[PDB]
């Protein structure tokens, strides 16, 4: 807690003297109020503080104290149902204290230091704990929150508290070296929480949308990236893959964006509904929120706060989904930080280390056996937005180098009212080769072959749309108007999906496989039929087509009974011509 005074102010750069021994990149309290800055460039005796807020008003003479720790997140119970900002401060209690403004000098704690949690111990006094071992749980929201040893400390244990009802400042286990372990603990936000084995992608991240798990899978632990133009239904897909997802803790990171583009989130994302209770969604959600005029280092550090919080929930054994929104905004926050440190830019004004930082973000993401002895993952759906539709912008190019799946969202499909507005031409997935045996042993045995059949049929429709554009759909050959008709029924019942309809929203693998096989069986008997005994108008006018069109509006509890009737009716009604 080394303390000195100010000897120079210039903008946000405060050269403060009298600090021999402040460790570099500590954060420190400037002034009598406490403006939190960080310590750059120790020089002899002095130390150059970079203040987050604006420094209008400080005099030469005010004391600087050092907190002693680097940029610290505070992990512990009570973090859920929370709206933080980029340096983990709760915006709700700042609203309760200081009206409607984030006034400078606000000191609030991340976790409630005045809320009792119902402790339940799970070690005996006498045992030996190491890092990442569970030592007792807490009922948070119908949610057995666990309490872990921080990742360094180890030893035996006397004096575990009994099953009381405590607060987060209470030492609950007291090791043999003093060493009183509280419920919570800090962690530096720029270091990976260490685990024992990063596993390998064997298991799909079941999203719910039957395009983004059938055609372009993302494989829990991996990494997806989406661009967002306007109108393309960005928010509805983000909210639908937080709502109907697989992973049971959701962390949303809005990393500096338009204020009215995130106040819709803050007035709509709480009032969703978790479809496992019927209760709210925020009982499994952390929501880090930044507008643009919040200070630059908060916007720079927000995705690190988000990934470190989601690693903490990974370390308990829960599947975690992280949606880091508009990483191009984070990139230009980093560009401003590079400008004030007097660095030579890269291609555009970005620093040299841009791909290093984005790799550090998207590579703390993966299926894992934790230090406790159980699995988890931090699968990232991290979005991007070029300001011009202008891929080979450096941020989007580095993102597409290190992602695993990439999902375009054309507004043109949203203009033609095709939701989810994913484009199956520009998108791609690199996890189809690893998810092969999981499909072959859990969904169905032939699954990837009819996946590839549908994918190349889309390829064919998109290929010979050309003389459809030159001539028209009604004067083709007869085996090519068939291709565009089955391509149309694929687009209008297997890809298009009403996210508000209560049963069309969620679609598992058995249901998507049934719809998929049903369309493919219709096509493989119609292409055999068009050369022997039927016209085209004696095919497209046939009342099984309405049953394939209704097939997605079927509860999965009553689907396979409908699938049997539909398949046998296909076989009969194509026998009947």
């Amino acid at each position: 807690m080394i303390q000195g005074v100010i000897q120079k102010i210039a903008g946000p750069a405060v050269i403060a003297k009298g600090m021999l021994g402040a460790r570099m990149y500590d954060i420190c309290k400037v002034g009598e109020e406490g403006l939190v800055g960080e310590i750059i460039r120790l020089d002899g005796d002095t130390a150059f503080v970079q203040v987050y807020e604006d420094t209008s008003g400080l005099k030469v003479g005010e004391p600087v104290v050092s907190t002693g720790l680097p940029l610290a997140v505070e992990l512990g119970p009570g973090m859920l149902n929370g709206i933080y900002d980029g340096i983990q401060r709760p915006l709700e209690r700042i609203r309760e204290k200081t009206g409607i403004y984030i006034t400078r000098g606000v000191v609030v704690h991340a976790l409630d230091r005045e809320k009792k949690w119902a402790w339940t111990p799970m070690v005996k006094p006498g045992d030996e704990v190491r890092g990442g071992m569970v030592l007792g749980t807490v009922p948070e929201f119908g949610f057995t929150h666990k309490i872990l040893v921080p990742p360094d400390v180890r030893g035996r244990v006397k004096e575990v508290k009994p099953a009381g009802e405590y607060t987060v400042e209470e030492p609950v286990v007291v090791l043999e070296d003093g060493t009183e372990l509280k419920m919570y603990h800090t962690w530096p936000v720029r270091r990976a929480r260490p685990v024992q084995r990063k596993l390998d992608p064997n298991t799909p991240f079941l999203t719910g949308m039957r395009i983004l798990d059938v055609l372009f899978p993302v494989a829990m632990g991996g990494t997806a990236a989406i661009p967002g133009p306007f109108g393309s239904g960005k928010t509805v897909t983000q909210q639908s893959l937080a709502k109907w997802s697989n992973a049971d803790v959701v962390v949303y990171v809005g990393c500096g964006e338009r204020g009215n583009e995130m106040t819709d989130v803050l007035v709509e994302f709480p009032e969703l509904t978790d479809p496992k209770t019927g209760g709210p969604l925020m009982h499994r959600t952390v929501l880090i929120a930044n507008t643009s005029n919040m200070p630059v280092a908060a916007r720079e550090a927000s995705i690190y706060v988000g990934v470190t919080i989601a690693e903490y929930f990974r370390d308990q054994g829960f599947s975690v989904a992280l949606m880091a929104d508009s990483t191009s905004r984070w990139a230009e926050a980093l560009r401003e930080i590079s400008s004030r440190l007097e660095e030579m830019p890269a291609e555009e004004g970005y620093p040299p280390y841009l791909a290093a930082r984005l790799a550090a973000f998207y590579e703390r993401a993966g299926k894992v056996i934790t230090l406790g002895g159980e699995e988890g993952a931090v699968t990232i759906v991290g979005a991007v937005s070029p300001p011009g539709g202008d891929m080979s912008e450096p941020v989007t190019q580095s993102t597409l180098r290190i992602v695993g799946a990439f999902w375009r969202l054309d507004a043109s499909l949203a203009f033609r009212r095709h939701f989810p507005a994913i484009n199956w031409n520009g998108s791609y997935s690199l996890f189809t080769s690893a998810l092969d045996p999981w499909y072959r042993e859990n969904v169905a045995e032939d699954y990837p072959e009819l996946r590839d059949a549908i994918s190349e049929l889309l390829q064919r429709e998109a290929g010979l749309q050309e003389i459809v554009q030159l001539v028209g759909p009604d004067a083709l050959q007869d085996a090519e108007r068939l291709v565009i008709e089955v391509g149309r029924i694929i687009r209008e019942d297997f890809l298009q999906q009403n996210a508000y309809h209560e049963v069309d929203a969620y679609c598992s693998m058995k249901k998507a496989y049934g719809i998929m096989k049903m369309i493919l069986a219709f096509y493989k008997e119609a292409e055999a039929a068009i050369k022997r005994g039927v016209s085209i108008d004696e095919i497209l006018q046939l009342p099984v087509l309405e049953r394939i069109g209704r097939a997605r509006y079927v509860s999965e509890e009553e689907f396979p009974a409908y699938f049997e009737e539909a398949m046998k009716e296909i076989q009969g009604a194509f026998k009947a011509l």
Binding site: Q7, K8, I9, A10, G11, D54, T55, S56, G57, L58, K59, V60, G61, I83, L91, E92, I94, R95, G99, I100, Y101, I102, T103, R104, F230, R258, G259, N260, E261, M262, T263, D264, L266, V267, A289, T291, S292, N293, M294, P295, V296, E332, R335, E336, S338, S339, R340, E342, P345, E348, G349, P387, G388
Partner: protein, 463 residues
């Protein structure tokens, strides 16, 4: 009880250094008394233990080292504000420039703004009519929104500025019935204007009667550049005061954000530091976000701030950093065009590249009228495929089109000179919509594919 730091050394261009000043805060305002007695202004940058630095506002001519002294005033920059200032003009710093006496400031506020709390910001929900029909129908300004006007150089952006200034009102008729009282204000920050544009504004406001609810922060080009930096801070803090403590609906019009960014680039070069992309400073995005994100409705407060910044794109590109970052914080743009202006069309908005990202949650049932978004979509797509048919007929010949393309040709050409070529009249929103349906009724029913059935049943068949 003043305290003159005399004992200054090193005047250079704008800068001057004071020897022993450990009392001046960073970012103070100071009086620089000459040898003869003319007082200048300065802002304290870079206070240190062995000297302090002052950036002089105005010219440095009478200054020497013997008889020159600085003196503190108001060690962080404040504005003395009242409700009374609704008939007054000011010059950047906030001193009256119309001969009426100084206001009695019931509050004093820091001109740099505290940022709003996103938990305490509800979402923009209701509209604000501007009279200009190509705005009010196809991309509606709603309350709590910031949308800029991407001028060119030669285009009359100042005239459409003054027209929205003296013509915008809310209208409490067409909401749910909402206490007509609902007072209204226009804060008008013209930064970096000429003398000619200034006399234009202080005649254009005085002739109608619309200076009794506005407030004008005008500075000329030959005023100090640091006053021009302070100007949108002054305007936004008056507006934010008014709207969130006296329930006003404030519209704020920031003229010439290009001149703001140029003054920002030159002061950033005076601060002895290093620029960023294309020569503009590094922190330009944050410094524009600081003065655009001070707008919006608030949960609980009745008031609302709406923000139209009017900016000239330098050499007609949206990939310049000024329209780049402005359109990258703000929501939509409306964009003037030299083509309609050379054909002679006032106001020359073309609605094809224009966009409001927040119309869709501001118009419709109960807010303005039922058919609004459908009418706007149909107008946009019909004019958009009228334009390419016009471009096509210069080679096809008018004979070899069908009947239907010919009807789109007549639609486009009567659209851009009855719906857009407004003149200087005031089109309230229903006059705009009846001209909209009269323009759509040069097309047959069922060609109007976007509009649902009842509106085509009810409003079609006019003019």
């Amino acid at each position: 009880l003043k305290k003159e730091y005399t004992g200054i050394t090193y005047i250079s261009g704008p800068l001057l250094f004071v020897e022993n000043a450990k009392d001046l805060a960073y970012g103070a305002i100071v009086d620089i008394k000459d040898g003869t007695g003319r007082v200048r202004g300065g802002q304290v940058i870079e206070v240190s233990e062995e000297y302090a630095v002052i950036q002089v506002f105005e010219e440095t001519t009478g200054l020497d080292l013997a008889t020159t002294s600085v003196s503190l005033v108001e060690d962080v920059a404040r504005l003395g504000v009242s409700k009374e200032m609704l008939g007054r003009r000011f010059n950047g710093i906030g001193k009256p420039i119309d001969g009426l006496p100084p206001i009695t400031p019931e509050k004093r506020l820091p001109i740099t703004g505290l940022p709003l709390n996103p938990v305490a910001r509800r979402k923009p929900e209701q509209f604000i009519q501007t009279g200009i029909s190509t705005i009010d129908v196809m991309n509606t300004l709603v309350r709590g929104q910031k949308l800029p006007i991407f001028s060119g150089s030669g285009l009359p952006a100042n005239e459409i500025a003054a027209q929205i200034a003296r013509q915008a009102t809310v209208r409490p008729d067409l909401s749910g019935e909402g206490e007509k009282e609902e007072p209204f204000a226009v804060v008008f920050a013209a930064m970096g204007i000429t003398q000619r544009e200034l006399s234009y504004f202080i005649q254009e406001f005085e002739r109608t009667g619309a200076l009794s609810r506005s407030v004008l922060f005008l500075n000329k080009a030959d005023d100090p550049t640091i006053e021009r930096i302070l100007t949108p801070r002054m305007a936004l803090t008056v507006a934010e005061y008014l709207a969130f403590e006296h329930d006003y609906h404030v519209l704020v019009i920031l003229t010439d954000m290009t001149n703001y960014c140029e003054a920002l680039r030159e002061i950033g070069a005076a601060r002895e530091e290093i620029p960023g992309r294309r020569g503009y400073p590094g922190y330009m995005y944050t410094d524009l976000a600081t003065i655009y994100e001070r707008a919006g409705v608030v949960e609980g407060k009745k008031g609302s701030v709406t923000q139209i910044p009017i900016l000239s794109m330098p050499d007609d590109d949206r990939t310049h950093p000024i329209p780049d970052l402005t359109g990258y914080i703000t929501e939509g743009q409306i964009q003037l065009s030299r083509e309609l202006h050379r054909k002679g069309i006032y106001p020359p908005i073309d609605p094809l590249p224009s966009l409001s990202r927040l119309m869709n949650n501001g118009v419709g049932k109960g807010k303005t009228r039922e058919d609004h978004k459908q009418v706007s979509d149909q107008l946009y797509s019909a004019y958009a495929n009228g334009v390419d048919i016009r471009k096509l007929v210069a080679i096809i010949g008018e004979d070899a089109l069908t009947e239907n393309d010919r009807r789109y040709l007549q639609f486009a050409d009567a659209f851009e000179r009855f719906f857009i070529n407004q003149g200087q009249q005031n089109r309230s929103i229903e006059e705009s919509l009846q001209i909209a349906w009269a323009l759509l009724s040069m097309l047959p029913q069922g060609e109007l594919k976007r509009i649902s059935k009842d509106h085509i049943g009810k409003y079609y068949g006019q003019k």
